[PDB]
Design an enzyme around this catalytic site. Sequence first.
Site, mmCIF file in Angstrom:
data_model
loop_
_atom_site.group_PDB
_atom_site.id
_atom_site.type_symbol
_atom_site.label_atom_id
_atom_site.label_comp_id
_atom_site.label_asym_id
_atom_site.label_seq_id
_atom_site.Cartn_x
_atom_site.Cartn_y
_atom_site.Cartn_z
ATOM 1 N N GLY A 62 6.153 95.066 -42.530
ATOM 2 C CA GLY A 62 5.512 93.835 -42.978
ATOM 3 C C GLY A 62 6.332 92.881 -43.839
ATOM 4 O O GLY A 62 5.912 91.742 -44.075
ATOM 5 N N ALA A 63 7.495 93.315 -44.329
ATOM 6 C CA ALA A 63 8.384 92.468 -45.132
ATOM 7 C C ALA A 63 9.394 91.683 -44.307
ATOM 8 O O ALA A 63 10.052 90.755 -44.794
ATOM 9 C CB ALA A 63 9.164 93.311 -46.126
ATOM 10 N N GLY A 64 9.520 92.092 -43.038
ATOM 11 C CA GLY A 64 10.372 91.408 -42.083
ATOM 12 C C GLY A 64 9.691 90.160 -41.528
ATOM 13 O O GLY A 64 8.517 89.884 -41.799
ATOM 14 N N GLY A 65 10.461 89.427 -40.710
ATOM 15 C CA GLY A 65 10.033 88.184 -40.093
ATOM 16 C C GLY A 65 8.769 88.288 -39.258
ATOM 17 O O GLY A 65 7.789 87.607 -39.564
ATOM 18 N N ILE A 66 8.750 89.152 -38.239
ATOM 19 C CA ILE A 66 7.591 89.287 -37.353
ATOM 20 C C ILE A 66 6.379 89.855 -38.087
ATOM 21 O O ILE A 66 5.267 89.351 -37.928
ATOM 22 C CB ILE A 66 8.041 90.167 -36.144
ATOM 23 C CG1 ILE A 66 9.077 89.376 -35.331
ATOM 24 C CG2 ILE A 66 6.869 90.540 -35.257
ATOM 25 C CD1 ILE A 66 9.817 90.190 -34.251
ATOM 26 N N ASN A 94 5.437 97.852 -35.907
ATOM 27 C CA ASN A 94 6.565 96.946 -35.953
ATOM 28 C C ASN A 94 7.776 97.473 -36.746
ATOM 29 O O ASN A 94 8.293 96.806 -37.657
ATOM 30 C CB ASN A 94 5.998 95.637 -36.512
ATOM 31 C CG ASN A 94 6.980 94.501 -36.725
ATOM 32 O OD1 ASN A 94 7.079 93.966 -37.825
ATOM 33 N ND2 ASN A 94 7.761 94.114 -35.732
ATOM 34 N N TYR A 126 20.190 101.708 -29.692
ATOM 35 C CA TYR A 126 19.107 100.744 -29.767
ATOM 36 C C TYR A 126 18.472 100.562 -28.386
ATOM 37 O O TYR A 126 17.243 100.577 -28.287
ATOM 38 C CB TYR A 126 19.620 99.404 -30.299
ATOM 39 C CG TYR A 126 18.473 98.437 -30.566
ATOM 40 C CD1 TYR A 126 17.634 98.599 -31.678
ATOM 41 C CD2 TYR A 126 18.243 97.398 -29.662
ATOM 42 C CE1 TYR A 126 16.573 97.716 -31.888
ATOM 43 C CE2 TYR A 126 17.187 96.509 -29.866
ATOM 44 C CZ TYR A 126 16.356 96.678 -30.977
ATOM 45 O OH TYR A 126 15.320 95.786 -31.172
#
Lengths: 267, 267, 267, 267
Positions: B14-18, B89, B157
């Site tokens: 939740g601290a990231g962009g999306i 996410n 990845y």
Amino acid sequence: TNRLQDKVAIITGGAGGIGETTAKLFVRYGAKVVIADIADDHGQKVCNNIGSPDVISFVHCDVTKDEDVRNLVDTTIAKHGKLDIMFGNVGVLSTTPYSILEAGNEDFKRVMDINVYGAFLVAKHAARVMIPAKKGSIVFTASISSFTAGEGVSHVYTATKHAVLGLTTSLCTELGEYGIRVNCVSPYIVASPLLTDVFGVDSSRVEELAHQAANLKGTLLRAEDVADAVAYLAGDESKYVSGLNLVIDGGYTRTNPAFPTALKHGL
Amino acid sequence: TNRLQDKVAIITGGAGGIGETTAKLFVRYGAKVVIADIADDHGQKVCNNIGSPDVISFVHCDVTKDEDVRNLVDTTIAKHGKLDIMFGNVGVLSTTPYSILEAGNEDFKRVMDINVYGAFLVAKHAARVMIPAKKGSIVFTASISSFTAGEGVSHVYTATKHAVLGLTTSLCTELGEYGIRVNCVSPYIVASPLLTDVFGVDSSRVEELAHQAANLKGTLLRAEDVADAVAYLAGDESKYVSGLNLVIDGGYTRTNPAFPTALKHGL
Amino acid sequence: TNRLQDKVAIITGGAGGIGETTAKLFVRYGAKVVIADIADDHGQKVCNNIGSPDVISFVHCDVTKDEDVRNLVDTTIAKHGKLDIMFGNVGVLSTTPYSILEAGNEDFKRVMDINVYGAFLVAKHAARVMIPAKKGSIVFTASISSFTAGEGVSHVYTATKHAVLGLTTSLCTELGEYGIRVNCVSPYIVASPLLTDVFGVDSSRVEELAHQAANLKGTLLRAEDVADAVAYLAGDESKYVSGLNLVIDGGYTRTNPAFPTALKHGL
Amino acid sequence: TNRLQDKVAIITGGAGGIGETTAKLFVRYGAKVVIADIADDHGQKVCNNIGSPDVISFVHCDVTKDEDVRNLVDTTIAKHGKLDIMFGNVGVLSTTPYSILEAGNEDFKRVMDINVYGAFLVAKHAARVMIPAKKGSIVFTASISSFTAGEGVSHVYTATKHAVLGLTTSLCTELGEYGIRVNCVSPYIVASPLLTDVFGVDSSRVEELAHQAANLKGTLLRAEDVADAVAYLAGDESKYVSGLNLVIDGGYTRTNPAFPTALKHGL
């Protein structure tokens, strides 16, 4: 029987059915093969009496150990001077219940480690000796679980077979530059060993269940058919084939017959 | 309008962009949301922007720890009574070089543990809580690397984003029986990347080359575009879609322009 | 809310289930819509239900006639000044038996002409009008038959729905350059089918067997679910998705349950 | 060279490169082959001096004419008593501009008729004589255009190659019941004839453009590589392979290199 004349191949897995059968075929086609696995086979008459000791040898190797895979490849280059084919055939099943409510955390980590990291290592050490020669064919054993799901097929196993397809695609794209091809084979249920179900856990019985459920009647999928697909991708008659997921399922995954059937009897 | 009125959502990463922009959109649509991330003071800093403590909250959660994800889910049920949406996410990039020869064994294990085992845990605890209610929508963030390869995109990845699609597929097949939907979203380059860490290239520079290499011109992929796709899958407007890999790449992966470009455009 | 406020949409196959309900939804979202179908008095009967003559209208159009599709598009531009959305919704079923031995050459040519050449014409005239404005979203109705086969699903219907996905893919790649998006939707069995024409089986009966054979339980696929997916692709909430085959099948095509079912459930 | 010993094969196309080369290979492997096409070959030394008149014969056949395909199959059963392999190798390109704004309506209909209906007919008459024997392998020539788009590759051609993949999938699902396998091959650019571009429309030059743009360096895709893939699918070492799209592109379609490249030089 000279299709692979003087090619050097490493087959991991080996004491399982597909590995044994592909080793027999590769020797029949004139290759020198090094069989690897931890179990140190069934007895002796698998790896040593697949072919004669001049064409086949056995190496103990745990594919989750970098030192073991390093030793497998370096032993092979020492013995035969080159590596033409790497057949990564190690895949384990879940040990825990199908159902996300009961599927095991440690079991998820164990199967990922064997099925995905082990494949990464085998490919990494194969690439280390193939990239300088600018020659090579790497084949992974995947499954129809690399692109489809199934009731009773664990979430870890279909996540790891999707990941082996991911490694095939990613490695294909890096290694094409050095002329190395990377492919995988995706089978439906292969005849034997036996394989469990608390029902009729018997090979002949699951072979007739597999045929009953098959698209493509009149034949059973066998280890020799998978070995044939691997020999095609491994040799020079597939020299422009790379990044292919060679599905060997007789068309099983081309349809979901549930609604035609729940229309026919299921009323 | 308020498309998600009364729904309760968990958003990891939740601290990231999306994560942040999807949390902002879900609150705008009338949902109650619980943000989770390991960047604890950093992520509640982010929550303190989006909304008031009665509709949005932050809990620290390392998604590779079963005890943290259990905590996250049990706290949401304690606070809000139900879980309608789980937005899984969390994804990390490799921290070693692209080449299979330099790729790195411990880095491979770490990204696998976060990207795939972390996604399994989030989905497992969401299913534990959702299956009794016979309702739910689980969305994973995948990537176009869930079905393609790329120069400079690490082998781990690509393997782990293929594995996330595997988990989406096999969970969709188990959980449909309980009326629960499972889908994933697969973006191209979202707005930024900021690479001052390596040799040069900033945000607006990567944004420019991403548009130059894009299929869809005249717009950039934003975190808000990804949030919109998640909102579609999360709500009531997608009541019969499950098992979908919702690709948001403006058609980038529908062609390889290298040979068209080689038979020149104009020099 | 009014997600499509001021947008102008053309919907072909507007007298059918998906066409009518998508027209109803687009008017609810604030769009101006022009319905088109060959069932001329029958389709304007349908338009006379949805809304008033200033926001919805009907023009007769045979989509295999270039002159009719040119008419349809030029009339919409004459009436409304622009075309934001083209929903290419015409597909017909084969009228000869499933078996390749009984399938029928003239029927094959007719379904091909309507399903693929008709879709090309609609997209061609939409592109003619949309490319000057550098804006547009074209959505085709495909089917899960765009990537799978089915017992009882004709060979021509499966070929033409694969071809519609081909058109979506190649048009997405050309038109991205002008900021235009092209996508398709691929449904499972939508609500009804009514087969009293053949031996028995009615609407609610097919609805029951479709749910019995479904992956996602507790709900039926409705024309309103398909309309919702079209609305997503048609509007501003999908500004970076192009080339997507949006499958709406509740996960039906993610597995073939035949072998799981063969290793019995319980007799 | 006995891989196909006494198998009877029909190859359509034949006066094109892949057809000629596959006929040479099939004869080398011990098959009896009937070459078909309208052009009545280049001269004589293609079909008649591929092999000797005891193993190869030529038949004029327009694949869009049911009477011609009926005669091709019935002539073959009259000559050799059975049909083991049908290789449908007819595919034509668009005659009109790439660009939906200029792409021709009659040209769309012509290429669909040749590429899709012609394939339907070849398969229909092959199935008519194979279904009673409960033996057979049908192989279609598709293209990487059966699942990807390309700048300059016409919308009709990629819609028809997607449709040939659709017929492969649909026929695989019906014909598995009789033990018949149906597959297709999807090549990248195959070396020669020459093929036009108002630039350097020269085979050696487009071969070096194709290599420049290739994934998989150090080799060129040739008709002999496609013939090798067809012989694998045609014979008995692929007896559980059906519904496979055997991509032969050296990994070209596994990536879109646009953004890595527009990062590398493209700045």
